[PDB]
Design a binder for this molecule. Structure first.
Ligand code: HEM
Ligand code: HEM
Ligand SMILES: [Ca+2]
Ligand SMILES: [Fe+3]
Ligand SMILES: [Zn+2]
Ligand SMILES: [Zn+2]
Ligand SMILES: [Zn+2]
Length: 708
């Protein structure tokens, strides 16, 4: 049409940004910490082969993987980071040993001058004994092997049942015998070791580790890289030079069968939401019987979110589809809508059940990757059920894309608003696919890549787009926006959302085995996602303090903007710069970001859809002004309560000790089980309840709208 300029602008951004994201992926595959063929102990005693690790990886998924504690910065925050906790002990044990044989004292009786003399040896041994090329085999010294075999007892007693370390496990919210088979434990530790190896050893090319010196370990000088600083100030420039430009100031002056089906869709979303916040409190109480332990209550807490939020978005789109098609279903829509609904119930019910058996070792650890627990945060489904939800999303696009070719028919009307909105829904449908391309014993580095195409590009990138696209469609069809307004703004917002979104992804991969390039791309581009925030919060305040148009959605789609500013913005870009994330990755800083960002934005959006559909599916069914009120505030103040008086304080405290002593310490057992940390953990269950309250209210309100 006449918008060809903006269309080319969009095609430009998509071409540019997808290449960066593609390239930085090829380099993930190439220059990722390889699994060694064998770990030989100078003498000969091979400690492990290739599959000694790859098994311990498979064995890690068995426990719930990232659902117990973090590994390489990614996971859960009650247990320690295993890659950090491993490296630290394996170093300390190495020292005590060499301080003995050289001076005959336990390093603490050895004088400052000598301590620092030992650590020089330590760093050279550890950091400069890199994977021998052309025959990828690694060679260790004997004082190290003795070091490992003196810490393995503790790890067997924590992942097991050794009665000594009972409260240890309890402090880590771990059900006694998290891995009952000492068969597998032996292998899990070969994985735990190799991770710690990838994080403590220089690349073939550099004087930093495969993990860009992650984590922060003073005893081998795992200090921020050099390129770290170069780019983590670049980005802070860009951001500020961003805000300066955008803001240079004020107070500106501008029913058919299928549709009727969506009632149970609405119910599902509120149902599942309240299923989730419960499981949330449950898994929150574990941080202060274990058929369903911490590892499980958390897994569902993560899983229900994606579902109920995604489902709310699907549901919305399904309602609009007939409305697009004049006002009539083309064929057996209602039929496909029922199929889809079954599907979604088979994925949700299916997975949850599968999860139960894997984390009790009832499922055979040969079906573990497909029907058990993937061990990978946000994708702990099982390759089968994940494909089933994939098929489901495909069907949703099928049903979706049908109603649209009927409106691509008339000769008169401008088919541009449609055009972009059509791409939008594809975005939702097709783009869960990336996270398919990784196997059981796929390199951790690679899985880490694709996972974030989903947990980042999908739920942030394409949902962002769909929200605005559907909004524009409605906003124009309601008649509060002209054609050449709603049509135009969608095409720009699509360009803006995607500019920071696409390459930004890489803010996840700064340390999980990438080239220092990751810090460059991620840091720069993710700084541009500032203009969407400012723009929204700007307009959202402008279109607010006014009387012109009048349980009103502005509430919903203002709160949205607000959290998109506190959570995606403040807490998001506080943690975005490589220099920062180098310390506060895997700390309660991320917990803040997540809660405020996921619920605060996409939670409300999702809830404001299923609510809107219910207001249309059962009209003249009168809302409750007191419920909606109570809810809208307990939820808001609730999130405010969670982040303020618990998560952030701890995050802060963690952040500090991470920086002063090392990360291993901010994750260490004694540090966690502390005076005010344990207390700040308690104060949470105050605002936890408040939150569940508003959650109940919104399910309750929603129910009595769809049912009667
Ligand atoms: C009272 C309500 C809630 C409570 C008590 C709660 C509690 C928790 C707990 C215990 C964790 C795990 C922390 C750890 O690993 O140690 C967590 C993480 C998480 N929660 Fe919630 N949660 C609540 C509401 C929500 C909501 C509304 C959402 C959004 C749908 C959500 C999404 C998440 C996500 C995505 C994570 C993973 C965070 C990360 O790995 O950094 N939670 N929450
Ligand atoms: C807009 C909606 C957003 C949502 C729903 C969201 C969601 C999340 C979630 C759930 C995590 C934790 C993942 C995990 O446990 O492994 C996370 C991490 C992160 N997000 Fe966001 N995010 C959003 C926007 C942003 C923005 C705008 C930035 C840019 C500053 C950003 C930067 C980050 C960074 C740097 C992390 C790293 C945390 C870590 O790996 O420990 N996010 N995000
Ligand atoms: Ca996490
Ligand atoms: Fe991200
Ligand atoms: Zn205790
Ligand atoms: Zn965004
Ligand atoms: Zn305006």
């Amino acid at each position: 049409g006449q918008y060809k300029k903006l269309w080319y602008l969009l095609f430009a951004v998509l071409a540019v940004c997808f290449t960066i994201l593609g390239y930085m992926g090829s380099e993930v595959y190439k220059k990722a910490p390889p699994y060694p063929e064998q770990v030989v102990s100078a003498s000969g005693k091979v400690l492990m082969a290739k599959d000694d690790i790859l098994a311990g990886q498979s064995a890690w998924q068995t426990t719930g993987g990232m659902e117990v504690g973090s590994v390489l910065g990614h996971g859960a925050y009650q247990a320690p980071d295993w890659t950090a906790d491993w490296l630290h002990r394996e170093l300390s044990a190495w020292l005590d040993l060499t301080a003995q044989q050289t001076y005959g004292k336990k390093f603490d009786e050895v004088s400052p001058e000598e301590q620092a003399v030992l650590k020089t040896r330590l760093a050279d041994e550890y950091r400069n004994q890199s994977r021998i090329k052309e025959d990828g085999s690694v060679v260790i010294s004997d004082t190290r092997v003795k070091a490992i075999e003196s810490i393995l007892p503790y790890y067997h007693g924590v992942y097991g049942d050794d009665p000594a370390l009972q409260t240890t496990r309890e402090h880590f919210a771990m059900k006694n015998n998290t891995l009952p088979s000492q068969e597998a434990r032996e292998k899990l530790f070969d994985f735990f070791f190799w991770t710690s190896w990838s994080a403590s050893t220089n690349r073939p090319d550099e004087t930093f580790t495969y993990t860009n010196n992650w984590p922060h370990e003073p005893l081998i000088n795992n200090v921020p890289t050099t390129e770290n600083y170069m780019w983590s100030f670049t980005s802070v420039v860009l951001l500020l030079m961003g805000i300066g430009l955008l803001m240079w100031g004020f107070l500106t002056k501008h029913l058919t069968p299928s549709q009727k089906a969506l009632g149970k869709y609405v119910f599902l979303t509120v149902a599942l939401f309240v299923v989730q916040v419960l499981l949330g409190g449950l898994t929150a109480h574990y941080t202060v019987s274990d058929w369903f332990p911490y590892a499980l209550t958390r897994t569902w807490h993560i899983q229900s979110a994606i579902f109920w939020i995604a489902t709310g978005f699907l549901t919305a789109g399904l309602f609009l589809a007939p409305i697009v098609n004049g006002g009539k279903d083309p064929k057996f829509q209602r039929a496909g809508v029922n199929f889809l609904y079954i599907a979604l119930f088979i994925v949700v019910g299916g997975s949850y059940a599968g999860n139960f058996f894997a984390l009790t070792h009832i499922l055979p650890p040969e079906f573990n990757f497909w029907f058990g627990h993937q061990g990978y945060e946000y994708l702990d489904l099982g390759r089968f059920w994940q494909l089933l939800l994939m098929v489901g999303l495909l069907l949703w696009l099928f049903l979706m894309l049908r109603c649209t070719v009927s409106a691509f028919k008339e000769k008169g009307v401008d088919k541009n608003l449609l055009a972009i909105f059509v791409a939008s829904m594809v975005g939702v449908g097709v783009f869960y696919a990336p996270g398919l391309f990784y196997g059981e014993k796929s390199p951790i580095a690679v899985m880490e890549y694709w996972r974030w195409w989903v947990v980042h590009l999908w739920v942030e990138g394409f949902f962002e787009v769909f929200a605005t696209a559907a909004f524009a469609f409605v906003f124009y069809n309601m008649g509060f926006v002209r054609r050449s307004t709603a049509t135009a703004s969608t095409l720009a917002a699509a360009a803006i959302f995607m500019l920071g979104g696409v390459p930004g992804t890489l803010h996840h991969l700064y340390f999980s085995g990438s080239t220092s390039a990751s810090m460059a791309i991620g840091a720069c581009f993710s700084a541009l996602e500032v203009v969407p925030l400012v723009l929204l919060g700007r307009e959202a305040y402008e279109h607010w303090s006014y009387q012109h148009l009048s349980r009103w959605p502005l509430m919903c789609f203002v709160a949205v903007a607000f959290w998109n500013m506190i959570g995606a913005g403040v807490f998001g870009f506080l943690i975005n710069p490589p220099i920062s994330l180098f310390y506060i990755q895997g700390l309660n800083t991320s917990a803040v970001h997540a809660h405020a960002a996921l619920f605060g934005v996409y939670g409300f959006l999702a809830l404001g859809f299923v609510l809107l559909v219910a207001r249309y599916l059962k009209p003249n069914v009168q809302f409750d002004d007191k419920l909606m009120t109570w809810g809208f505030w307990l939820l808001n103040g609730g999130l405010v309560g969670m982040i303020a008086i618990s998560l952030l304080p701890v995050g802060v405290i963690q952040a500090y000790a991470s920086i002063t002593h090392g990360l291993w310490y901010a994750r260490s057992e004694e540090f966690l089980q502390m005076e005010i940390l344990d207390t700040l953990r308690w104060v949470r269950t105050a605002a936890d309840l408040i939150f569940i309250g508003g959650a109940i209210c919104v399910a309750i309100q929603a129910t009595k709208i769809v049912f009667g």
